[PDB]
PDB file of C-alpha atoms in Angstrom:
ATOM      1  CA  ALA A   1      -0.306   0.275   0.026  1.00  0.00           C
ATOM      2  CA  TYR A   2       1.459   3.681  -1.055  1.00  0.00           C
ATOM      3  CA  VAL A   3      -0.491   5.495   1.922  1.00  0.00           C
ATOM      4  CA  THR A   4      -3.494   7.346   1.509  1.00  0.00           C
ATOM      5  CA  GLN A   5      -3.401  10.159   3.347  1.00  0.00           C
ATOM      6  CA  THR A   6      -1.363  13.261   4.667  1.00  0.00           C
ATOM      7  CA  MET A   7       1.757  10.801   5.417  1.00  0.00           C
ATOM      8  CA  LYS A   8       1.792   9.892   9.329  1.00  0.00           C
ATOM      9  CA  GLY A   9       5.190  12.302  10.621  1.00  0.00           C
ATOM     10  CA  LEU A  10       4.324  14.707   7.434  1.00  0.00           C
ATOM     11  CA  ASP A  11       5.776  17.270   9.180  1.00  0.00           C
ATOM     12  CA  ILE A  12       5.147  20.873   6.457  1.00  0.00           C
ATOM     13  CA  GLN A  13       8.844  21.279   8.612  1.00  0.00           C
ATOM     14  CA  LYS A  14       9.425  18.904   5.912  1.00  0.00           C
ATOM     15  CA  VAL A  15       8.638  20.795   2.894  1.00  0.00           C
ATOM     16  CA  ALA A  16       9.533  24.376   3.722  1.00  0.00           C
ATOM     17  CA  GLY A  17      10.878  26.882   0.862  1.00  0.00           C
ATOM     18  CA  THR A  18      10.003  25.642  -2.176  1.00  0.00           C
ATOM     19  CA  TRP A  19       6.450  24.851  -3.976  1.00  0.00           C
ATOM     20  CA  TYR A  20       5.552  24.846  -7.286  1.00  0.00           C
ATOM     21  CA  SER A  21       1.852  24.287  -8.933  1.00  0.00           C
ATOM     22  CA  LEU A  22       2.400  21.991 -11.028  1.00  0.00           C
ATOM     23  CA  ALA A  23      -0.955  21.512 -10.386  1.00  0.00           C
ATOM     24  CA  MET A  24      -4.473  23.155  -8.462  1.00  0.00           C
ATOM     25  CA  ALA A  25      -7.545  22.083  -8.960  1.00  0.00           C
ATOM     26  CA  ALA A  26     -11.090  21.479  -7.259  1.00  0.00           C
ATOM     27  CA  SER A  27     -13.775  19.354  -6.222  1.00  0.00           C
ATOM     28  CA  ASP A  28     -16.382  21.602  -7.386  1.00  0.00           C
ATOM     29  CA  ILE A  29     -16.020  24.073  -9.511  1.00  0.00           C
ATOM     30  CA  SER A  30     -17.602  26.734  -6.310  1.00  0.00           C
ATOM     31  CA  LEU A  31     -13.711  26.426  -4.477  1.00  0.00           C
ATOM     32  CA  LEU A  32     -12.473  27.440  -8.451  1.00  0.00           C
ATOM     33  CA  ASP A  33     -15.430  29.517  -9.580  1.00  0.00           C
ATOM     34  CA  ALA A  34     -14.302  32.646 -11.329  1.00  0.00           C
ATOM     35  CA  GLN A  35     -11.618  32.698 -14.659  1.00  0.00           C
ATOM     36  CA  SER A  36      -8.407  32.747 -12.051  1.00  0.00           C
ATOM     37  CA  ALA A  37     -10.376  30.953  -9.058  1.00  0.00           C
ATOM     38  CA  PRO A  38     -10.199  31.925  -5.508  1.00  0.00           C
ATOM     39  CA  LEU A  39      -8.379  28.558  -4.436  1.00  0.00           C
ATOM     40  CA  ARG A  40      -6.210  28.635  -7.742  1.00  0.00           C
ATOM     41  CA  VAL A  41      -2.691  29.714  -6.497  1.00  0.00           C
ATOM     42  CA  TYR A  42       0.443  28.419  -7.446  1.00  0.00           C
ATOM     43  CA  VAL A  43       3.247  28.748  -4.359  1.00  0.00           C
ATOM     44  CA  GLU A  44       6.211  30.651  -4.461  1.00  0.00           C
ATOM     45  CA  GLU A  45       7.950  30.258  -0.685  1.00  0.00           C
ATOM     46  CA  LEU A  46       7.086  28.536   2.780  1.00  0.00           C
ATOM     47  CA  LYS A  47       8.463  30.236   5.316  1.00  0.00           C
ATOM     48  CA  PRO A  48       7.548  28.134   8.056  1.00  0.00           C
ATOM     49  CA  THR A  49       7.177  29.705  11.979  1.00  0.00           C
ATOM     50  CA  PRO A  50      10.092  28.737  14.177  1.00  0.00           C
ATOM     51  CA  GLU A  51       8.536  25.817  14.249  1.00  0.00           C
ATOM     52  CA  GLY A  52       4.896  25.914  15.942  1.00  0.00           C
ATOM     53  CA  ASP A  53       3.149  26.727  11.904  1.00  0.00           C
ATOM     54  CA  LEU A  54       4.289  27.388   9.150  1.00  0.00           C
ATOM     55  CA  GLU A  55       3.411  30.770   6.953  1.00  0.00           C
ATOM     56  CA  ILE A  56       3.816  30.074   3.296  1.00  0.00           C
ATOM     57  CA  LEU A  57       2.658  33.072   0.971  1.00  0.00           C
ATOM     58  CA  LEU A  58       1.947  32.242  -2.802  1.00  0.00           C
ATOM     59  CA  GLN A  59       1.169  34.274  -6.167  1.00  0.00           C
ATOM     60  CA  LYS A  60      -2.771  34.343  -7.069  1.00  0.00           C
ATOM     61  CA  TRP A  61      -3.953  35.175 -10.772  1.00  0.00           C
ATOM     62  CA  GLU A  62      -5.745  38.128 -11.197  1.00  0.00           C
ATOM     63  CA  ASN A  63      -7.472  39.694 -14.748  1.00  0.00           C
ATOM     64  CA  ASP A  64      -4.466  41.808 -14.472  1.00  0.00           C
ATOM     65  CA  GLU A  65      -3.417  41.729 -10.769  1.00  0.00           C
ATOM     66  CA  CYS A  66      -1.096  39.287  -8.756  1.00  0.00           C
ATOM     67  CA  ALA A  67      -2.567  38.998  -5.306  1.00  0.00           C
ATOM     68  CA  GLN A  68      -1.446  36.869  -2.804  1.00  0.00           C
ATOM     69  CA  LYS A  69      -2.615  34.599  -0.321  1.00  0.00           C
ATOM     70  CA  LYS A  70      -2.175  33.784   2.906  1.00  0.00           C
ATOM     71  CA  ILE A  71      -1.634  30.182   4.249  1.00  0.00           C
ATOM     72  CA  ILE A  72      -1.326  30.337   8.106  1.00  0.00           C
ATOM     73  CA  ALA A  73      -1.793  26.286   9.002  1.00  0.00           C
ATOM     74  CA  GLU A  74      -1.262  24.938  12.099  1.00  0.00           C
ATOM     75  CA  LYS A  75      -2.754  21.157  13.036  1.00  0.00           C
ATOM     76  CA  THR A  76      -2.804  21.672  16.647  1.00  0.00           C
ATOM     77  CA  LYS A  77       0.559  20.915  16.783  1.00  0.00           C
ATOM     78  CA  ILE A  78       0.743  21.007  13.688  1.00  0.00           C
ATOM     79  CA  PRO A  79       2.249  18.206  11.212  1.00  0.00           C
ATOM     80  CA  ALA A  80       0.050  18.373   8.040  1.00  0.00           C
ATOM     81  CA  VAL A  81      -3.551  20.390   8.762  1.00  0.00           C
ATOM     82  CA  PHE A  82      -4.221  23.592   9.133  1.00  0.00           C
ATOM     83  CA  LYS A  83      -6.559  25.865   9.385  1.00  0.00           C
ATOM     84  CA  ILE A  84      -5.369  29.271   7.157  1.00  0.00           C
ATOM     85  CA  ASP A  85      -7.841  31.406   8.485  1.00  0.00           C
ATOM     86  CA  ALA A  86      -8.064  34.092   5.932  1.00  0.00           C
ATOM     87  CA  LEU A  87      -9.995  33.829   2.235  1.00  0.00           C
ATOM     88  CA  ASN A  88     -12.593  31.255   3.287  1.00  0.00           C
ATOM     89  CA  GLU A  89     -10.380  28.707   4.709  1.00  0.00           C
ATOM     90  CA  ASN A  90     -10.011  27.292   7.855  1.00  0.00           C
ATOM     91  CA  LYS A  91      -8.730  23.780   7.406  1.00  0.00           C
ATOM     92  CA  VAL A  92      -5.812  22.437   5.113  1.00  0.00           C
ATOM     93  CA  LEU A  93      -5.409  18.649   4.571  1.00  0.00           C
ATOM     94  CA  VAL A  94      -1.992  18.238   2.809  1.00  0.00           C
ATOM     95  CA  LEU A  95      -1.583  14.140   2.542  1.00  0.00           C
ATOM     96  CA  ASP A  96       1.893  14.081   0.783  1.00  0.00           C
ATOM     97  CA  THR A  97       4.686  16.429   0.457  1.00  0.00           C
ATOM     98  CA  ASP A  98       8.492  15.449   0.619  1.00  0.00           C
ATOM     99  CA  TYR A  99       7.422  12.120   1.652  1.00  0.00           C
ATOM    100  CA  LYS A 100       7.476  10.902  -1.842  1.00  0.00           C
ATOM    101  CA  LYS A 101       8.724  14.212  -3.884  1.00  0.00           C
ATOM    102  CA  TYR A 102       5.416  15.926  -4.008  1.00  0.00           C
ATOM    103  CA  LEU A 103       2.969  17.650  -2.085  1.00  0.00           C
ATOM    104  CA  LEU A 104      -1.301  17.090  -2.152  1.00  0.00           C
ATOM    105  CA  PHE A 105      -3.360  19.350   0.226  1.00  0.00           C
ATOM    106  CA  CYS A 106      -6.171  21.697  -0.799  1.00  0.00           C
ATOM    107  CA  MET A 107      -8.499  24.152   1.079  1.00  0.00           C
ATOM    108  CA  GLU A 108     -11.608  24.462   2.090  1.00  0.00           C
ATOM    109  CA  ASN A 109     -13.433  25.293   5.375  1.00  0.00           C
ATOM    110  CA  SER A 110     -15.694  23.020   7.189  1.00  0.00           C
ATOM    111  CA  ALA A 111     -18.959  25.298   7.287  1.00  0.00           C
ATOM    112  CA  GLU A 112     -20.177  23.903   4.033  1.00  0.00           C
ATOM    113  CA  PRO A 113     -16.374  23.625   2.127  1.00  0.00           C
ATOM    114  CA  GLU A 114     -16.483  19.661   1.655  1.00  0.00           C
ATOM    115  CA  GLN A 115     -17.765  21.241  -1.586  1.00  0.00           C
ATOM    116  CA  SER A 116     -14.609  23.566  -1.153  1.00  0.00           C
ATOM    117  CA  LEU A 117     -12.198  21.363  -0.893  1.00  0.00           C
ATOM    118  CA  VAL A 118      -9.235  21.944  -3.839  1.00  0.00           C
ATOM    119  CA  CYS A 119      -6.177  19.971  -3.636  1.00  0.00           C
ATOM    120  CA  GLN A 120      -2.946  21.392  -4.415  1.00  0.00           C
ATOM    121  CA  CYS A 121       0.191  19.671  -5.517  1.00  0.00           C
ATOM    122  CA  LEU A 122       3.245  21.186  -4.830  1.00  0.00           C
ATOM    123  CA  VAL A 123       6.246  20.141  -6.705  1.00  0.00           C
ATOM    124  CA  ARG A 124       9.534  20.118  -6.224  1.00  0.00           C
ATOM    125  CA  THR A 125       9.814  16.658  -7.522  1.00  0.00           C
ATOM    126  CA  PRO A 126      12.985  14.756  -9.072  1.00  0.00           C
ATOM    127  CA  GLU A 127      12.135  17.483 -11.823  1.00  0.00           C
ATOM    128  CA  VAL A 128      10.036  20.753 -11.612  1.00  0.00           C
ATOM    129  CA  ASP A 129       8.531  18.662 -14.022  1.00  0.00           C
ATOM    130  CA  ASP A 130       4.886  17.235 -14.729  1.00  0.00           C
ATOM    131  CA  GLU A 131       6.536  14.254 -11.998  1.00  0.00           C
ATOM    132  CA  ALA A 132       4.143  15.608  -9.741  1.00  0.00           C
ATOM    133  CA  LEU A 133       1.353  15.747 -12.170  1.00  0.00           C
ATOM    134  CA  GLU A 134       1.409  12.271 -13.324  1.00  0.00           C
ATOM    135  CA  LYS A 135       1.708  11.647  -9.439  1.00  0.00           C
ATOM    136  CA  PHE A 136      -1.218  13.830  -9.839  1.00  0.00           C
ATOM    137  CA  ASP A 137      -2.773  11.531 -12.180  1.00  0.00           C
ATOM    138  CA  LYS A 138      -3.038   9.714  -8.884  1.00  0.00           C
ATOM    139  CA  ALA A 139      -2.407  12.963  -6.425  1.00  0.00           C
ATOM    140  CA  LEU A 140      -5.194  15.421  -6.208  1.00  0.00           C
ATOM    141  CA  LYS A 141      -5.347  14.120  -9.425  1.00  0.00           C
ATOM    142  CA  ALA A 142      -6.302  10.993  -8.694  1.00  0.00           C
ATOM    143  CA  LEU A 143      -9.496  12.181  -8.953  1.00  0.00           C
ATOM    144  CA  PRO A 144     -12.379  13.258 -11.184  1.00  0.00           C
ATOM    145  CA  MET A 145     -11.570  17.029 -10.032  1.00  0.00           C
ATOM    146  CA  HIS A 146     -14.592  19.129 -11.562  1.00  0.00           C
ATOM    147  CA  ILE A 147     -12.185  21.539 -12.723  1.00  0.00           C
ATOM    148  CA  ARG A 148      -9.101  20.944 -12.455  1.00  0.00           C
ATOM    149  CA  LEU A 149      -5.781  22.728 -13.778  1.00  0.00           C
ATOM    150  CA  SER A 150      -2.111  22.362 -14.372  1.00  0.00           C
ATOM    151  CA  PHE A 151       0.254  24.136 -16.030  1.00  0.00           C
ATOM    152  CA  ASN A 152       4.022  23.323 -17.191  1.00  0.00           C
ATOM    153  CA  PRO A 153       7.360  23.634 -15.179  1.00  0.00           C
ATOM    154  CA  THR A 154       9.047  26.039 -17.762  1.00  0.00           C
ATOM    155  CA  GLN A 155       7.285  29.327 -16.425  1.00  0.00           C
ATOM    156  CA  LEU A 156       7.204  27.497 -12.835  1.00  0.00           C
ATOM    157  CA  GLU A 157      10.692  29.599 -12.506  1.00  0.00           C
ATOM    158  CA  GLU A 158       9.173  32.772 -12.967  1.00  0.00           C
ATOM    159  CA  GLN A 159       7.007  34.511  -9.925  1.00  0.00           C
ATOM    160  CA  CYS A 160       3.645  35.359 -11.183  1.00  0.00           C
ATOM    161  CA  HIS A 161       3.925  36.585 -14.977  1.00  0.00           C
ATOM    162  CA  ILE A 162       7.207  38.741 -15.479  1.00  0.00           C
TER     163      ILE A 162
END
């Protein structure tokens, strides 16, 4: 069995500083509603707090702007579930990350958000390569996303559009 959750001992501290969004996708277009969607962001850099939580900032596509999203993520003691409590977020589930090479986690916020669950697999892979994508076919792609998004690694080396 190749696990199927967050890994136990999945310490977000193990994924700190790089996140490439090979793809971000949503289970229901509602978490993905909008040409750019609110929870459809690619990650530029993670800044793990001194060790209590992991504070990671990312880039967001706006018709013309670069909006930025806040991820404050603590599962309790802080391993892989986090409430980020900004932009309709309150709980994040990281199913994988640097424990395999890729990361799997979506944002959503408990009130009636499970129809808000949009997983994001951040990359680092042994290449900024669809490696997370094939593994997406399985990671977050392993599922039947209803709005699904994936970009190439070539631009992943650039922030926003510039």
